[PDB]
RNA sequence: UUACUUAUUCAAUGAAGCGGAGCUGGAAUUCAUUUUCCACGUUCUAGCAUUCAAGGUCCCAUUCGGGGCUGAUCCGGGUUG
RNA sequence: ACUGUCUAAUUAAAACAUAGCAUUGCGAUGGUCAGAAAGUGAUGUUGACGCAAUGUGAUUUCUGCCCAGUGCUCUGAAUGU
């Protein structure tokens, strides 16, 4: 793996020749939805501060 | 006042300086001349019916080398008693353990012209 | 402001690796480090008996400051000093008919234990600093008794690097006056008398008091909290 | 007489353990500020077989907390976790299957295995297969656990020892017979070598303390000393009674 | 001098003096290597007396034996 | 008989958060007023967490950069049992 | 019971082993064992579904009475040695 090119030992994405293009997948739907969650987890926090 | 910061718990051993050697004598006073000079690494031709058969058609000239000599060595040797330039060296240890180099010559250089300036045929 | 952003991180445990502390709290020290902090912690914890206790009963920084400034008046003679004062009376003793006193009296300040030792036995010193850093301390333990049996006065001061530097030696552990210039007979009387007033006056009761015995400051919160939540309710 | 086949397994030769495919040492994570204070969130990476053991092992891989790395321990597999669980390790984790808690954080009546004996020495008690441990009681002033060994044997420990959930996976393991000397075999192929052990009473009387006779038979009482020298103890060592237990032995 | 003093009081080993000298170093020595280079003489006297010298080439090296 | 930790013994850790006090939070009841106790950043998810840390503030001589405090409470240097 | 093993060079067996059964020691400051010692080791990269010590020898059906003797063992006893 020293002695041939690049393009023989990755492909063209994100995690190229380390990860298989469905776990890259859910990898951005789950780096997605969480921190989108957490989101929601800042602010659900906020009304419960905010009303006790 | 106050005491250094330390972000780590282990302690390692400083970076002291340490002094280059300044003797007041010399290590042994004479240095010695070259243990393998370009005499001692060649020492002899190897004459055989079959050695010189390579002198006529491979274009190689069959040493007898010393013991402690490498390929670099025999290269440089050749080169330096008889001025041609060399285009591979073979060395194998013979069966009364004494070394045999298969110098070959290049293109330029007949090594049978060479082997009867040498002086053996 | 303009596209910089306010993000602080989050160094609770869970999210967001710690930074980097000063944790000299808590450095594996090489071994010298720890028998050299261990050995005082153990000389604090363990109950001393009285004849050592004397020692950390050390002289006050402005007395101390009196008597170094009083000591460096004393300073004896160095080794140019010699050459040029032994020129100076070998020329003289040669040719002017001298009997080799054709070089002044001294006043210096007598140290080496040995010395000045012998020069308390005979009553002859007139004040005896003592140093209190001494790694053998039985070199020294008798120095106070010894100077309360012969009526010399003493001061155990801190350093004796502080004493070597008078003397210039490296440590000289003792020093002594005991001829002193008439120029300085009060001075010296003065620092005699607070000196006495700090340690000759106070040696026969300080005898008695074990020192030591001293808790390490977990110890010592957990004892104070122990009092101040059994007997105060 | 000789030196008998006991008193060589101690000088280790062929008497050693055969720890060539073991995976490591099963131990919980040690205590450090997060496993006292807080928690800690690992992942279970993969569920795998240790050679030489009856118990699945887990590799559990946590998040360095002073350093930027991942740190991978192997626990005991507690029956029920699964390979992408999250295990919650430290002293306000909650009451599930596979987080580790200290014993005084768990109500009377938790069922834990892996259970440290001082708090801090990374898993003693209950840990082979199928065991568990019963928390049955607190005392805490002078903080100490009661808890209940899998030989019955009741033990006081640190209310700051720790334990996973659970009971360990792989039981019931021995209601299976071998049915075969391969299968004795391969059991004691990776572990040791006592597989095949002559009984001492057809040996002669250099190799054994029974060896001997025109018939094949003891001789002497079978119930050795406590207080006896090693050469002698050979038989039942300390035995306080005999012959087939009938009644609760059961100890309450 | 102070070496008479020092052989006189290296006698009473019992006293309180010497007896927290002994526990302190005793804890002090145990915590070095068995066979450890000394700076200088604990006993200046009885080294002295021994035939030692405060000068260049004069060695003590402080050594532990197991009893019994 | 039961207490101490400093001898001794055991164990863990690239000796990382120990001990004491504080800060706001609230349970909490005030016979004067705050006399005490618990907290004191992480739990749907097989993602991610690193460049003295971004920001707040003060210097340098503004060129690109560099430093101090804070962010990240103080104190004791007993690594922790 | 089987398959298996052993007396190389007079005995291959009904002997040994075996699975199965049972008993014992031991919760780590531990059981069993090693070393002349040790800041030393085997089991142990172990933890009672485990390690160590023995007896019996697949399955079916059972395993009776005796603790006086000799051992082992006990939260015991005491005014004997």
Redesign the pocket.
Same mark, same amino acid.
């Given at each position: 793996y020293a002695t041939v090119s690049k393009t023989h030992k990755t492909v063209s994405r994100a995690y190229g020749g380390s990860r298989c293009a469905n776990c890259v997948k859910?990898?951005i739907i789950?780096?997605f939805?969480?921190?989108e969650?957490?989101i929601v987890?800042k602010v659900v926090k906020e009304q419960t501060e905010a009303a006790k | 006042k106050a005491?250094?910061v330390?972000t780590?718990?282990?302690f390692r051993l400083p970076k002291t300086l340490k002094l280059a050697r300044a003797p007041k004598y010399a290590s042994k006073a004479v240095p010695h001349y070259n243990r393998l000079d370009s005499y001692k690494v060649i020492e002899q031709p190897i004459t055989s019916e079959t050695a010189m058969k390579k002198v006529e058609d491979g274009n190689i000239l069959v040493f007898q080398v010393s013991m402690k000599a490498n390929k670099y060595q025999i290269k440089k040797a050749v080169k330096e008693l008889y001025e041609v330039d060399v285009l591979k060296v073979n060395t194998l240890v013979r069966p009364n353990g004494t070394k045999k180099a298969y110098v070959r010559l290049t293109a330029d250089y007949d090594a049978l012209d060479i082997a009867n300036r040498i002086g053996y045929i | 402001?303009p596209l910089?952003?306010?993000?602080?991180?989050?160094?609770?445990?869970?999210? =967001?690796?710690?930074? $980097?502390?000063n @944790?000299?709290?808590?450095?594996?020290?090489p071994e010298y480090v720890?028998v050299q902090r261990?050995k005082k912690? @153990?000389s604090i914890?363990?109950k001393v008996p009285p004849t050592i206790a004397q020692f950390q009963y050390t002289l006050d920084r402005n007395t101390a400051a009196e008597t170094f400034k009083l000591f460096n008046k004393y300073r004896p003679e160095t080794a140019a000093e010699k050459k040029e004062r032994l020129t100076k009376e070998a020329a003289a003793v040669a040719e002017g008919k001298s009997k080799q006193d054709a070089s002044p009296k001294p006043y210096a300040v007598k140290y080496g234990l040995n010395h000045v030792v012998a020069l308390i036995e005979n009553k002859k010193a007139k004040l005896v600093l003592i140093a209190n850093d001494v790694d053998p301390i039985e070199l020294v333990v008798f120095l106070p008794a010894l100077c309360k049996k012969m009526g010399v006065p003493y001061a155990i001061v801190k350093g004796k690097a502080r004493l070597g530097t008078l003397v210039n030696q490296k440590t000289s552990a003792v020093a002594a006056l005991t001829e002193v210039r008439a120029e300085d007979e009060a001075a010296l009387a003065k620092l005699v008398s607070t000196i006495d007033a700090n340690f000759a006056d106070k040696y026969d009761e300080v005898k008695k008091h074990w020192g030591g015995?001293i @808790?390490?400051? $977990? =110890?010592?919160?957990?004892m104070d909290?122990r009092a101040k939540n059994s007997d105060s309710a | 007489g000789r030196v008998?086949?006991?008193?060589?397994? !101690? #000088?280790?030769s062929i008497?050693?353990?055969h720890?060539?495919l073991?995976?490591?040492?099963?131990?919980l994570r040690?205590?450090?500020? #997060?496993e006292?204070?807080?928690?800690?969130?690992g992942?279970v990476?993969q569920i795998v077989h240790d050679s030489?053991?009856? &118990?699945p092992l887990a590799k559990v891989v946590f998040?360095d907390?002073?350093?930027?790395r991942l740190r991978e321990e192997i626990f005991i597999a507690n029956e029920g976790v699964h390979?992408?669980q999250?295990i919650?390790a430290?002293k306000?984790? *909650?009451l599930?299957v596979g987080?580790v808690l200290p014993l005084g954080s768990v109500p009377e009546g938790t069922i834990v295995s892996n259970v440290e004996?001082?708090?801090?020495?990374?898993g /003693?008690? /209950?840990? #082979?297969?199928?065991?568990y441990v019963i928390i049955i009681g607190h005392n805490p002033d002078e903080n100490k656990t009661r808890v209940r060994?899998?030989?019955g044997?009741k033990?006081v420990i640190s209310s700051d020892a720790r334990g996973v959930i659970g009971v360990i996976a792989?039981?019931?393991?021995?209601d299976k017979?071998?049915?075969? #000397? !391969?299968?004795?075999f391969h059991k004691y192929r990776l572990?040791?070598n *006592?597989?095949?052990?002559?009984?001492?009473?057809?040996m002669n009387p250099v190799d054994?303390p029974?060896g001997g006779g025109n018939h094949?038979?003891?001789g002497? &009482? *079978?119930?050795?000393?406590?207080?006896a020298v090693?050469?002698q103890? &050979?038989?039942?060592?300390? /035995?306080?009674?005999?012959?087939?237990?009938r009644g609760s032995q059961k100890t309450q | 001098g102070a070496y008479k003093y020092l052989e006189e009081l290296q006698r009473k080993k019992q006293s309180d003096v010497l007896r927290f000298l002994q526990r302190v170093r005793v804890?002090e020595y145990?915590?070095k290597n068995v066979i450890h280079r000394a700076a200088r003489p604990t006993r200046p006297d009885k080294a002295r007396r021994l035939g030692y010298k405060a000068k260049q080439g004069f060695v003590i090296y402080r050594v532990r034996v197991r009893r019994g």
């Open positions: 859910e990898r789950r780096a939805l969480i921190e969650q957490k987890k | 005491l250094k330390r780590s718990a282990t | 402001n910089t952003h306010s993000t602080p991180k989050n160094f609770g445990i869970g999210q =967001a690796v710690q930074p $980097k502390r @944790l000299s709290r808590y450095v594996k020290w720890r261990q912690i @153990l914890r363990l015995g @808790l390490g400051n $977990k =110890a010592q919160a957990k909290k | 008998i086949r006991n008193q060589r397994k !101690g #000088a280790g008497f050693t353990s720890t060539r073991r995976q490591g040492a099963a131990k040690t205590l450090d500020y #997060a006292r204070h807080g928690y800690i969130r992942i990476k030489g053991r009856g &118990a998040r907390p002073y350093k930027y390979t992408g999250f919650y430290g306000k984790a *909650s599930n987080n004996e001082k708090p801090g020495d990374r /003693a008690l /209950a840990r #082979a297969s199928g065991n060994l899998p030989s044997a033990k792989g039981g019931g393991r021995v017979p071998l049915l075969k #000397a !391969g299968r004795a572990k040791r *006592s597989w095949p052990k002559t009984r001492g009473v057809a054994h029974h094949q038979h003891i002497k &009482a *079978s119930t050795i000393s406590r207080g090693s050469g103890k &050979a038989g039942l060592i300390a /035995a306080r009674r005999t012959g087939l237990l | 804890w145990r915590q």
